[PDB]
Paper text:
Using X-ray crystallography, enzymology, and cell biological studies on an insulinoma cell line, we show that, whereas streptozotocin competitively inhibits O-GlcNAcase and induces apoptosis, its galacto-configured derivative no longer inhibits O-GlcNAcase, yet still induces apoptosis. To further investigate the mode of inhibition of STZ, CpOGA activity was measured using the 4-methylumbelliferone-GlcNAc assay with a range of STZ concentrations and varying preincubation times of enzyme and inhibitor (2 min–18 hr). Both commercial (Sigma) and resynthesized samples showed that STZ inhibits CpOGA with an IC50 of 30 μM. However, the dose-response curves did not show an incubation time-dependent shift, suggesting STZ does not inhibit OGA through a covalent mechanism, in agreement with the structural data. Thus, in agreement with the structural data that show free, intact STZ binding to the OGA active site, there is no evidence for a time-dependent suicide/covalent inhibitory mechanism. Although our structure of the CpOGA-STZ complex does not support formation of a covalent intermediate or a tight-binding oxazolinium ion as recently suggested (Toleman et al., 2006), this complex was obtained by soaking procedures and cannot be taken as conclusive proof of the absence of such mechanisms. Nevertheless, in our hands, STZ, either resynthesized or from a commercial source, is a weak but purely competitive inhibitor without any evidence of time-dependent inhibition. Early kinetic characterization of OGA has shown that the enzyme is inhibited by GlcNAc, but not by GalNAc, unlike the GH 20 lysosomal hexosaminidases (Gao et al., 2001). This is readily explained by the structural data, which show that a conserved aspartic acid (Asp401 in CpOGA, Asp485 in hOGA) tethers the O6 and equatorial O4 hydroxyls. Indeed, mutation of Asp401 to an alanine abrogates CpOGA activity (Rao et al., 2006). Inspired by the CpOGA-STZ complex, the galacto isomer of STZ (Gal-STZ) was synthesized.
Protein O-GlcNAcylation was discovered two decades ago, and is an abundant, dynamic, and inducible posttranslational modification of serine/threonine residues on intracellular proteins in higher eukaryotes (Zachara and Hart, 2006; Hart et al., 2007). The O-GlcNAcase (OGA) hydrolyzes O-GlcNAcylated proteins to the free protein and GlcNAc (Gao et al., 2001; Hart et al., 2007). CpOGA contains an active site that is nearly identical to that of hOGA (Rao et al., 2006).
Author numbering: 41 to 624
Write the structure that this text describes.
C-alpha cells in the first residue's frame, strides 16, 4: 500500500493503485541486455530478501523487467505504458509498478542502477506500492571528498562508504586521504604491487556502485615548475596518472591548496598541459578537477574583484576544468546564491563545491549530526558539482551525507528538517526516535573564531528555555513550563541511556563520550529546575543542594573532551546559575 521513506526524494512520483505482493519466485526479464551493475545489485537484494528467480516464465509469478532505453526489450515497453526515460537527463530512469509487474528503464546504465536503488527502497516485507516514477539528479556530480584531518577511515570504512553512496545515488568519491603518501609526499611514485590490491578493491567497488573514483593528487609539497626540473616533474605527473589509469582510474583532481609557490600561472599551466597531454589524449577520462590555492570567497575576492592569484588562475585555467571552492568561508553558515553567482562569474563556468560539513577536524570533541543547512536551494544555476567533507567518524557521517544525497539529487524540494528526520528513520530503525533526541543536540559547529556551520542545536528546546526566563522575570506562573522541561530533560537522559544500551558498536564507538556528556548535561538541567523550584518555594536548603549538583554537572561537562549542545543544554545551567529569582 503506502510508500516507504525514499532517499533521494524521486523527481516525479505518482501512486496509481493499492499495491500488491511480490511473489517469492519471480519472472526476471531483460537480465542480459540491462546494465550488469544494476542487475548484480538486483540479484543481491533478491537473494537477501528470500526471493528466487524463475528459470522459466510465469506460474503467474510477479514479473520484473529491467533495461535501458533503445534496449531491445518489448516487455519493458509494455509494462511502462505511457511513462518513459527517453526524455530524461544522464543518470535518469523510469520506474513503474502495476498489477503484478515492475518495470525499470534507465536512460543509461547509471539510471538503470539508480532505478534498482529506488526499487529496493520501495519493497517492504515483499509488498510494493503501485507507482509511476520518472527520476534524475538536479546536480551532475554528487558525493564525498575524503579531505578531513585526524584518524583516517580504514579500508573497510571506505568499502562500506562506497556501497552507501551507491544506495543513495551519490556518484562521486574523491580519494585524497592524508594517510596515503602516494597522493602527496610520494606523489611522483606509482603504486607498488604491495598496494595494488587495496587500491583496486576501492576502484572496483566504486565502478560497481556507479561511483566515480577520483584520484586526488597534491604535488604542492615539492613540485618544481621551471627548466629541466619542472619538465621532469611534469613528466612524473603523466607517468603517475597513466599508472593509475592502468588500474582503471578515469577521474583525477590536482590540488594547489597547500603549495608555498603561490604562482597562479604555473598552477594553471600544469593543469592545461595535463588536460591536453593526458585527459584529452585518453578520451575516456572525465573532466579535470582542481583546488586553487585561494578556494573560499574570502581568500579569492577583495571588494567584489578577484585577488591577483584568483584573477590570473581564472584567466588561464581551461574552461573544461572543474574548479572547487568552499563557499564564503572555509567553514561558514551558508552558500547564498549571490556567493556562487560571484565566484561562477569570475571563473565564467559552473563551479564545484567542497562543503566543509560534517567535517569536525577543527573541533573534534563535537559530532556534526545535522542536515545540509545554509545551502541555497537554487545553487544548481551556478554549481554542477557538489561534495561534502565528512568526519573521521565514518558511521555517524552517514546522517549528514544522507541529507546531502537528497539535496544534490532533488534540490528544489529539499527540506532540511524533513531530510534530517528521514535520514535518521532510514538509518537507525527502531532506535530512530532515540537517535533523534541525541543528534538534535549536536548539529551546530562553532569553534568560536573562524569556523561555524550547521543548523542550531535543539531549536524548540532552546525556545522553551527562553520562554522560561521570560515568564520568571515577568513574575508569570511558570509551573506548567517547568513540568514540561522536566519532561524534556528526563527524555534526553532516557534516550541517551537506551542508545548506550542498544546502539550497534559501529555507531556507539564513535559517540560514547558525547552520549555521556548529554546525560551529564540533562542531569544538570534537571538540577537547575530544582534550584528555580526551590527559590519559588523559598526552600534555601533545597536551593543549595540543587545548586551544588547543577554546578558540578556543568563543571564535569566543561572539563570533558566531549562537546554537545553548548548553547542549549549546557548554557541553560549557566543561565539558571546566573538567575536570581529572589530579586524578581
Ligand atoms: C578545499 N580545501 N583544501 O583543498 C580544504 O577545505 N581544506 C581544509 C579541509 O581539509 C579541512 O577539513 C577544513 C576544516 O579544518 O579546513 C580546510 O582548510
Amino acid at each position: 500500500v503506502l510508500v516507504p521513506n525514499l532517499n533521494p526524494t524521486p523527481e516525479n512520483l505518482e501512486v496509481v493503485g493499492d499495491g500488491f505482493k511480490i511473489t517469492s519466485s519471480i519472472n526476471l526479464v531483460g537480465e542480459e541486455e540491462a546494465d550488469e551493475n544494476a542487475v548484480n545489485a538486483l540479484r543481491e537484494f533478491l537473494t537477501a530478501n528470500n526471493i528466487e528467480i524463475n528459470s522459466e516464465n510465469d506460474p503467474n509469478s510477479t514479473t520484473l523487467i529491467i533495461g535501458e532505453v533503445d534496449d531491445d526489450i518489448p516487455e519493458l515497453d509494455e509494462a511502462l505504458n505511457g511513462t518513459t526515460a527517453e526524455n530524461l537527463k544522464e543518470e535518469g530512469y523510469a520506474l513503474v509498478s502495476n498489477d503484478g509487474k515492475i518495470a525499470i528503464e534507465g536512460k543509461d546504465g547509471d539510471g538503470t542502477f539508480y532505478g534498482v536503488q529506488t526499487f529496493k527502497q520501495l519493497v517492504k516485507e515483499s509488498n510494493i506500492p503501485e507507482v509511476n516514477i520518472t527520476d534524475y539528479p538536479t546536480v551532475s556530480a554528487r558525493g564525498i571528498v575524503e579531505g578531513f584531518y585526524g584518524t583516517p577511515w580504514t579500508h573497510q570504512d571506505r568499502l562500506d562508504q562506497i556501497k552507501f553512496y551507491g544506495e543513495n545515488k551519490l556518484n562521486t568519491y574523491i580519494y585524497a586521504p592524508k594517510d596515503d603518501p602516494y597522493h602527496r609526499e610520494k606523489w611522483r611514485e606509482p603504486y607498488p604491487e604491495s598496494e595494488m590490491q587495496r587500491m583496486q578493491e576501492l576502484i572496483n567497488a566504486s565502478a560497481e556502485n556507479k561511483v566515480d573514483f577520483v584520484f586526488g593528487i597534491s604535488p604542492g609539497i615539492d613540485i618544481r615548475f621551471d627548466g629541466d626540473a619542472g619538465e621532469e616533474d611534469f613528466n612524473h605527473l603523466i607517468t603517475k596518472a597513466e599508472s593509475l589509469y592502468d588500474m582503471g582510474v578515469r577521474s583525477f583532481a590536482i590540488y594547489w591548496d597547500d603549495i608555498q609557490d603561490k604562482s597562479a600561472a604555473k598552477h594553471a599551466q600544469v593543469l592545461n598541459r595535463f588536460n591536453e597531454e593526458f585527459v584529452k589524449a585518453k578520451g575516456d577520462v572525465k573532466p579535470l578537477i582542481t583546488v586553487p590555492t585561494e578556494y573560499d570567497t574570502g581568500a579569492m575576492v577583495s571588494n567584489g574583484q578577484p585577488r591577483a592569484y584568483t584573477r590570473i588562475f581564472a584567466e588561464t585555467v581551461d574552461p573544461s576544468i572543474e574548479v572547487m571552492w568552499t563557499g564564503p568561508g572555509v567553514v561558514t553558515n551558508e552558500i547564498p546564491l549571490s556567493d556562487a553567482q560571484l565566484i561562477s562569474g569570475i571563473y565564467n563556468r559552473n563551479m564545484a563545491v567542497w562543503w566543509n560539513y560534517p567535517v569536525t577536524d577543527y573541533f573534534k570533541g563535537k559530532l556534526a549530526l545535522g542536515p545540509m543547512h545554509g545551502l541555497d536551494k537554487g545553487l544548481n544555476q551556478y554549481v554542477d558539482f557538489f561534495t561534502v567533507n565528512p568526519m573521521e567518524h565514518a558511521e555517524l557521517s552517514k546522517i549528514s551525507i544522507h541529507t546531502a544525497a537528497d539535496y544534490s539529487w532533488n534540490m528544489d524540494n529539499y527540506d532540511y528538517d524533513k531530510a534530517w528526520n528521514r535520514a535518521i528513520d532510514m538509518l537507525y530503525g527502531d532506535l530512530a526516535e532515540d537517535m533523534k533526541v541525541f543528534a538534535n543536540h549536536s548539529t551546530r559547529m562553532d569553534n568560536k573564531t573562524w569556523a561555524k556551520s550547521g543548523r542550531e542545536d535543539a531549536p524548540e528546546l532552546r525556545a522553551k528555555m527562553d520562554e522560561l526566563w521570560n515568564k520568571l522575570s515577568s513574575k508569570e506562573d511558570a509551573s506548567a513550563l517547568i513540568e514540561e522541561l522536566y519532561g524534556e530533560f528526563a527524555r534526553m537522559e532516557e534516550a541517551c541511556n537506551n542508545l548506550k544500551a542498544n546502539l550497534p558498536e559501529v555507531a556507539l564507538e564513535e559517540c560514547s563520550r558525547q552520549l555521556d556528556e548529554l546525560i551529564t548535561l540533562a542531569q544538570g538541567d534537571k538540577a537547575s529546575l530544582d534550584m528555580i523550584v526551590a527559590q519559588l518555594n523559598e526552600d534555601t536548603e533545597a536551593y543549595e543542594s540543587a545548586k551544588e549538583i547543577a554546578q558540578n554537572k556543568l563543571n564535569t561537562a566543561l572539563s570533558s573532551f566531549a562537546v554537545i549542545s553548548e548553547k542549549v543544554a549546557q548554557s541553560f545551567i549557566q543561565e539558571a546559575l546566573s538567575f536570581d529569582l529572589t530579586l524578581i
